[PDB]
Amino acid sequence: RHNLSIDGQPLSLAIYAEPTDPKALLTSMVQASQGGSAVLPGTLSLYRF
Amino acid sequence: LNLAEMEKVWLERDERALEVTRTVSLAQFYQALSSDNFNLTEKLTQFLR
Numbered sequence: 001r002h003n004l005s006i007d008g009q010p011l012s013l014a015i016y017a018e019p020t021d022p023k024a025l026l027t028s029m030v031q032a033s034q035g036g037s038a039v040l041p042g043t044l045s046l047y048r049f
Numbered sequence: 050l051n052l053a054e055m056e057k058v059w060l061e062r063d064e065r066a067l068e069v070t071r072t073v074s075l076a077q078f079y080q081a082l083s084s085d086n087f088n089l090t091e092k093l094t095q096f097l098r
Contacts, residue, residue, distance in 0.1 A: 047060075
């Protein structure tokens, strides 16, 4: 009834659908907004330019 | 950095000074003293003799 031979050996070859390959993992540079310095009013020196 | 700090405060707090001359006559100064006064020439010549 279970499709075996007289000895119990199976009569139908099975299948399992081999796992799908390796996987690629990558890294990336990340950038963010950056500001600059400010300028203040200047002092008046005692010396010439 | 410490030298730069010294230089910055020197330039910022530098000042052109008023330049004054004061003439002092010792005979006048000793004669005009309130408490312990005397005459310069008279006491000088007396001390030499």
